[PDB]
């Protein structure tokens, strides 16, 4: 009539959501959105990235040419992953920090192996075995040297190899553990043998140790593998009275974005940026549950499992 | 909130508001009516979206780095590995929690604001015409339709020609 | 704080009100008195103990880590170690101080908030009846003995009957 | 009369507090609380945590068993600590990453040692030592075997021991280094020794030293610790030329919550969940200034001494 | 901010205030005028140098640590002090954004709030001898020379003495 | 006349400031302050600290002592700077952990190298070098003592050296590795030698290898380098029946503040509290953009290069 009322006010939803403040616990709230990644998108994404799947080989057995790890000869990736049932075919091995040797590849992200021409007058190359087949014949690493005696005699080995490259050359080399003393002097005449490699910069002595292990695939005997970095300008340098297992050339170090991981569920053809043993996962939210270890462009690691950041008001709904 | 407006001396929200996130409701000469206010909500939501912006999508690249998990024993590396990475994780995982507990209580707060803020505004506008009811309501002392109330709604609400009127109703017995 | 009320315009606290932490001092028909309001000083209390819930008693288990203090010189490792503790120190050292900072910061603006609020809340009761002396002080402008004020306390003041009064004694010369 | 007067205000105190804020550096408010724990209880609580008091044993010669350590045979615990004063009586020695081996008892949490039956024959057992005491008679190790010829000849052992428990076995095993040519025949035999000890995943191959060190309670000769795991399904194996000190069993590996700790102050009968080297701590408040150095549910540690976080409003007293 | 005062209900700020922060303008018998407000300008100063002073100048003496980048490659010693660095570096740069961006809301939220201040506190003053405009300024319904606004200015400014002239201009026709 | 109008209002200016909120990317204030330090100095200050200029010296071969790093005898540093074209003059090594004793030395923060009576009989001593020239004849080394036959024998050496000081004292020796066969006999009698050095609480036997490396300023043979320490109490002792190469005293251990850097800028007249790589850095300011690498009372780095804290209120000018 001759006045009028104007009440001011705000909207309210039936079915809020409850959220954190710095004085409340659980206050009640319009909406609310997720930071929490919890679930994964089950599989592995072809992309955007370049995965290659290890299946029944190491990355280590790769990068040494282990027989039935011949099909990643030329093979590069953005991360590698290495599968839990995956094993060694060829002569039984270990090696002075296999870890660091494993990050050392995967980092660079390729086993592309370039030949190198060496010699060695005197002995005779390419030693087979039976324990590491290649089709049904008895073979060895591919990319490993088994060096022996010739004739009647393994003359003290003096070799070497200029990197004249414009990069940091990989090289990759062993020794002979023999299971019996005759062994050691049936194959490389010598009772005791030594396998010095050095350059300008540095060396590294080996010497074997006879006697019987546990078999491995029918080997009581051992082959310890290392391996020499060579900046260019530097000489590669190798000396072995006997149980050399020589290198055929080097690998290439670059720079990489590559690694490897730890999974065991298959890669499929979704797409992501990021990628965790459990699978790849959603990129958008700044946190994550799933797993601590993971690639690529990809949210924080915490340990709760949600944390709900209030993005409405404070719901109040009418009073009964 | 801080303001003591919603949750406070507006003492409920209403769920047939869905316009937007503040408003009128009124009651005049020509029935009862219902409006949102664009301006206010839009503020708030814009400011929601900047806090959004800020948290969500930024996103780092992150390639080889160390192990998190082994197998065998080995001593004094792994127990600096896991430790190491256990820090981290502890460390961020502080920093989210903090994160949406000032991010909230900032929310609450912010949108606390909005509703005092569309208040004062109004207010102000009425002038010496109206009386604050302190549940959000204004008693406006003079016939005010449909246009008059769109003029508040508007800003374009001129009290200098219903002063008179106004004023009258305001101050007798009767 | 951001109010402008405790430490403002209110000029100083009452060393003698013990019932609470907020309430009323007044002068009537029937003499002086002072009240607490619990309405307002629980809702500061239970924000406060909100805080402390979420800082206090939320420990986390921590079993073998690493050595952070050695006696041999050793190199490489050592000093990874005591930098990798070193930093950790750092980081939640930093997390501590800034927490205290924004914490209290928050607090006085909080009970400042709730200051202004029974303010506010009150004045609102009074419609038309009083004034704001500045000082945080309503001249009521008609009698208002104990049960008056108690009504006011209670928020169950009904301005509309002292009305006329009021408004009486606000306007004339005399 | 015919007007009233309505008041609004706050309390205050007469003794208020003084707090930081993110504008002041001191600004004083009616009540706070402290949120670092400054002080320790003084000593450590045997509640609620399983403590062990080390006294004149350190946790490595408690595993290896020092006869002055057989105190600790049958014992475990979910914090072992270690004092100052302790020390070594048994035979002198050195161990290749002495905290490594500590730090994977101590986490363990336990020097429970399951006794396995080894045999070697063809070599006389037990060897006993004059700076090696159990009661007044001269013993060694009670966990080691010294191996030494039997007659006139020490045999190439070769001795194995299969892993068929659901478990990773831990056993330790170590090496003589003799003080001059003669004790290393008339106890060996031969003139230079190996220790070979292998499974099928790894190996670890000493060879001793002969020459004399400093005295260590009358001993110029040394013996190095060494230790293998074994993983279940696994096998152990050890060839030994001369100069091994053979084990007695296996330690077994449990994943723990246990950890060792450097402490010298008296353990006591209070009550806590958190332990630092200064005693226990309250566990209540969230950091603390005691010791960066702790074990169990226990306050981050920070460089401040003291941070008071405000616990009420400004206090405004009246003005003079 | 908050209080939608700045950038808010005071439609824009003033160029030519280089007394201070804060201030008035006004319009009397005597002329046009502008003033600062000292009270006030300095209160937000403060502040900000309390910001100021706790972030700047507080820096920490640090000697051997780790190497941070390196020409050979090693495998897994280098990489946990390349991660462990990159942590280190990360979690701080995090600290660095959201500090300032605090600060930030709350130094706009600071300088809004005396905005604010000043403007209650002169209504205050003025009491049933003015009325808010809605724009920042008030009307002043009586006679007000530069030593009655000095007064206001001041804080002195005694309202009893023009009541009834204000209350005269404020309630009629004319 | 009969009334009059008081308007409230704030400053502003014409040129402001855009900062970052938590709700707004770029809002614009009247000022603002840089809390991220972008550029350096330009050159490293001589003050507050001591710095030292490396030149054509690394810090190695400023402890060890070739010939042309005479200048750094009686040296002390807060700071040691590393220059990028530095090398060495004296014969060819390596040493095993280069890094670990490079920092156990700059953190000591000195070079000074004091001397002790040393005896050897039955051997020659002070080795020379056509590749370690001081002056324009054959030297060695400064600080370590090449021992070799005298007549016709090497006898086994046993010398000892109590460290009775007041502190941890540190040993530098190594070890020849010979070109060839005739160079070990014809310098050291043996065939194969050793040396064993060792104290109360450990020990470090080593084994040199013969055969010929790289050339390295014409010296295909090498000269590995090892350290020891001994606590106050304890006594050094060396066994060598070939291939030493003796040290002459000790190194002093104090608790530093001192370190190393690898910096290719200039020393200047300046003054600052801290450095790093690219020239010392105003202190000023919370954060850093430069480098993190750091010395000193020194910002923290970050990954942003600009971070305005606003100094000022919103900026609101007059709008068109
Ligand atoms: C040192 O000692 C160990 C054990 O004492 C010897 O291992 C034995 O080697 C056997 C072959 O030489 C091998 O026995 C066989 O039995 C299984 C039956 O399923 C089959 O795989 C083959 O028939 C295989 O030949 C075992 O590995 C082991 N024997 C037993 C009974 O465990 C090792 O040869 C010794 N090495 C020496 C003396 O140099
Ligand atoms: C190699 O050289 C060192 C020192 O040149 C020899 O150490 C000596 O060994 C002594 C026993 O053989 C021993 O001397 C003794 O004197 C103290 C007196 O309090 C008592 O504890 C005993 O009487 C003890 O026998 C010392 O440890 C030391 N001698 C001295 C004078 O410091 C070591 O035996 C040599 N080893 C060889 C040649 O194989
Ligand atoms: C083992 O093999 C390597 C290479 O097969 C030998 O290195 C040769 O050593 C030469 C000196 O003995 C040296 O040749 C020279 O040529 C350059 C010309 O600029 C000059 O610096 C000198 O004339 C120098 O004598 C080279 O370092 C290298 N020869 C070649 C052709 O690369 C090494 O001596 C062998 N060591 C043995 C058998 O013990
Ligand atoms: C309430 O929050 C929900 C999700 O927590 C919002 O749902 C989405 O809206 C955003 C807005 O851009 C979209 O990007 C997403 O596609 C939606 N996600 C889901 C899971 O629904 C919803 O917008 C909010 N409600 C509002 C604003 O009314
Ligand atoms: C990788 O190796 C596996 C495991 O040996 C191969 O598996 C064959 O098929 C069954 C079931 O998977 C296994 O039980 C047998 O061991 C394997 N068969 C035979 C006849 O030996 C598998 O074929 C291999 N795949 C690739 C791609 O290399
Ligand atoms: C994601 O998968 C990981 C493995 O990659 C899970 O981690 C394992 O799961 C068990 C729970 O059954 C936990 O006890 C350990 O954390 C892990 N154990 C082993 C032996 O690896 C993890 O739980 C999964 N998480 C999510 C969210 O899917
Ligand atoms: C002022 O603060 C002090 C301690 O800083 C408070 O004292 C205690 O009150 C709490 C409340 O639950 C108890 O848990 C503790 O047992 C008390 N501790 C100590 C050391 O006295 C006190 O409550 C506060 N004063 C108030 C609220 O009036
Ligand atoms: C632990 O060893 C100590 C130190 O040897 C033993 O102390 C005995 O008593 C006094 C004073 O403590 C020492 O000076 C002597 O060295 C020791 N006495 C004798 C006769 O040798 C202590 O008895 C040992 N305690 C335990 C529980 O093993
Ligand atoms: C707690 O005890 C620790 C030892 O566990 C103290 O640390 C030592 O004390 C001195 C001060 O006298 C400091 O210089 C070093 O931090 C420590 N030195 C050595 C040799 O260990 C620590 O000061 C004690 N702190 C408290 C709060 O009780
Ligand atoms: C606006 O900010 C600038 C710098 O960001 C201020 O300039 C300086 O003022 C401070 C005040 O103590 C001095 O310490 C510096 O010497 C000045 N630095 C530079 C680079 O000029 C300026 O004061 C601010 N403007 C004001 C407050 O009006
Ligand atoms: C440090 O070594 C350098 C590099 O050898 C010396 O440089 C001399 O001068 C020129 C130009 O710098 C170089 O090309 C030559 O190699 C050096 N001259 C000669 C005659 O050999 C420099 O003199 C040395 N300085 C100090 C202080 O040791
Ligand atoms: C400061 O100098 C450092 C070197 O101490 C610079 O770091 C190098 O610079 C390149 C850019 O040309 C970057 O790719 C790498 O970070 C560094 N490379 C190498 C080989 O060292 C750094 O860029 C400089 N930064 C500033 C702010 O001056
Ligand atoms: C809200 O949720 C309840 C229970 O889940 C459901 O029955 C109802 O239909 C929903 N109503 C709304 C959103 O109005
Ligand atoms: C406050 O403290 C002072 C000095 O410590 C003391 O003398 C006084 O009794 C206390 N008075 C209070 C709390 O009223
Ligand atoms: C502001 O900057 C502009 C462009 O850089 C310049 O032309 C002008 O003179 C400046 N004017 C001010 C601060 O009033």
Same mark, same amino acid.
């Given at each position: 009539? $001759?006045?009028?009322?104007? #009440?001011?006010?705000?909207?309210?939803?039936?079915?809020?959501? &409850?959220?954190?403040?710095?004085?409340?616990?659980?206050?009640?709230?319009? !909406?609310?959105?997720?930071?929490?990644?919890?679930?994964?998108?089950?599989?592995?994404? !072809?992309?955007?990235?370049?995965?290659?799947?290890?299946?029944?080989?190491?990355?280590?057995?790769?990068?040494?040419?282990?027989?039935?790890?011949?099909?990643?000869?030329?093979?590069?990736?953005?991360?590698?992953?290495?599968?839990?049932?995956?094993?060694? %075919? #060829?002569?039984?091995?270990?090696?002075?920090?296999?870890?660091?040797?494993?990050?050392?590849?995967?980092?660079?992200?390729?086993?592309?192996?370039?030949?190198?021409?060496?010699?060695?007058?005197?002995?005779?190359?390419?030693?087979?075995?039976?324990?590491?087949?290649?089709?049904?014949?008895?073979?060895?690493?591919?990319?490993?040297?088994?060096?022996?005696?010739?004739?009647?005699?393994?003359?003290?080995?003096?070799?070497?190899?200029?990197?004249?490259?414009?990069?940091?050359?990989?090289?990759?080399?062993?020794?002979?553990?023999?299971?019996?003393?005759?062994?050691?002097?049936?194959?490389?005449?010598?009772?005791?043998?030594?396998?010095?490699?050095?350059?300008?910069?540095?060396?590294?002595? @080996?010497?074997?140790?006879?006697?019987?292990?546990?078999?491995?695939?029918?080997?009581? /005997?051992?082959?310890?593998?290392?391996?020499?970095?060579?900046?260019? /300008?530097?000489?590669?340098?190798?000396?072995?009275?006997?149980?050399?297992?020589?290198?055929?050339?080097?690998?290439?170090?670059?720079?990489?974005?590559?690694?490897?991981?730890?999974?065991?569920?298959?890669?499929? @053809?979704?797409?992501?940026?990021?990628?965790?043993? %459990?699978?790849?996962?959603?990129?958008?939210?700044?946190?994550?549950?799933?797993?601590?270890?993971?690639?690529?462009?990809?949210?924080?690691?915490?340990?709760? %499992?949600?944390?709900?950041?209030?993005?409405?008001?404070? !719901?109040?709904?009418?009073?009964? | 909130?801080?303001?003591?407006?919603?949750?406070?001396?507006?003492?409920?929200?209403?769920? /047939?508001?869905?316009?937007?996130?503040?408003?009128?409701?009124?009651?005049?000469?020509?029935?009862?009516?219902?409006?949102?206010? &664009?301006?206010?909500?839009?503020?708030?939501?814009?400011?929601?979206?900047?806090?959004?912006?800020?948290? @969500?999508?930024?996103?780092?690249?992150?390639?080889?780095?160390?192990?998190?998990?082994?197998?065998?024993?080995?001593?004094?590396?792994?127990?600096?590995?896991?430790?190491?990475?256990?820090?981290?994780?502890?460390?961020?995982?502080?920093?989210?929690?903090?994160?949406?507990?000032?991010?909230?209580?900032?929310?609450?707060?912010?949108?606390?604001?909005?509703? $005092?803020?569309?208040?004062?505004?109004?207010?102000?506008?009425?002038?010496?015409?109206?009386?604050?009811?302190?549940?959000?309501?204004?008693? @406006?002392?003079?016939? #005010?339709?449909?246009?008059?109330?769109?003029?508040?709604?508007? /800003?374009?609400?001129?009290?200098?020609?219903?002063?008179?009127?106004?004023?009258?109703?305001?101050?007798?017995?009767?």
């Amino acid at each position: 009539n $001759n006045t009028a009322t104007l #009440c001011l006010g705000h909207h309210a939803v039936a079915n809020g959501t &409850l959220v954190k403040t710095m004085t409340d616990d659980q206050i009640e709230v319009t !909406n609310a959105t997720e930071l929490v990644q919890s679930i994964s998108m089950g599989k592995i994404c !072809n992309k955007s990235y370049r995965i290659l799947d290890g299946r029944n080989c190491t990355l280590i057995d790769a990068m040494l040419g282990d027989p039935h790890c011949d099909a990643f000869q030329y093979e590069s990736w953005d991360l590698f992953i290495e599968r839990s049932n995956a094993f060694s %075919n #060829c002569y039984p091995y270990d090696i002075p920090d296999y870890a660091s040797l494993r990050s050392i590849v995967a980092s660079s992200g390729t086993v592309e192996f370039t030949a190198e021409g060496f010699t060695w007058t005197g002995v005779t190359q390419n030693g087979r075995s039976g324990a590491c087949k290649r089709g049904s014949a008895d073979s060895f690493f591919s990319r490993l040297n088994w060096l022996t005696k010739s004739g009647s005699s393994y003359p003290t080995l003096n070799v070497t190899m200029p990197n004249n490259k414009n990069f940091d050359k990989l090289y990759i080399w062993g020794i002979h553990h023999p299971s019996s003393n005759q062994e050691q002097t049936k194959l490389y005449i010598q009772e005791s043998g030594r396998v010095t490699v050095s350059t300008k910069r540095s060396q590294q002595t @080996i010497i074997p140790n006879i006697g019987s292990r546990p078999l491995v695939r029918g080997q009581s /005997g051992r082959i310890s593998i290392y391996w020499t970095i060579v900046k260019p /300008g530097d000489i590669l340098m190798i000396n072995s009275n006997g149980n050399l297992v020589a290198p055929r050339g080097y690998f290439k170090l670059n720079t990489g974005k590559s690694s490897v991981m730890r999974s065991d569920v298959p890669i499929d @053809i979704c797409v992501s940026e990021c990628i965790t043993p %459990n699978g790849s996962i959603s990129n958008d939210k700044p946190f994550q549950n799933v797993n601590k270890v993971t690639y690529g462009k990809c949210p924080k690691y915490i340990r709760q %499992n949600t944390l709900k950041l209030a993005t409405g008001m404070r !719901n109040v709904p009418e009073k009964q | 909130g801080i303001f003591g407006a919603i949750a406070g001396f507006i003492e409920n929200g209403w769920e /047939g508001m869905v316009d937007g996130w503040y408003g009128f409701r009124y009651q005049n000469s020509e029935g009862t009516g219902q409006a949102a206010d &664009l301006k206010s909500t839009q503020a708030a939501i814009d400011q929601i979206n900047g806090k959004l912006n800020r948290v @969500i999508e930024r996103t780092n690249e992150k390639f080889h780095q160390i192990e998190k998990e082994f197998s065998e024993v080995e001593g004094r590396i792994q127990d600096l590995e896991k430790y190491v990475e256990d820090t981290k994780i502890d460390l961020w995982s502080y920093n989210a929690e903090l994160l949406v507990a000032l991010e909230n209580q900032h929310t609450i707060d912010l949108t606390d604001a909005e509703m $005092n803020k569309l208040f004062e505004k109004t207010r102000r506008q009425l002038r010496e015409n109206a009386e604050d009811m302190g549940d959000g309501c204004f008693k @406006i002392y003079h016939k #005010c339709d449909n246009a008059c109330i769109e003029s508040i709604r508007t /800003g374009t609400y001129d009290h200098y020609i219903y002063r008179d009127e106004a004023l009258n109703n305001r101050f007798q017995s009767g």
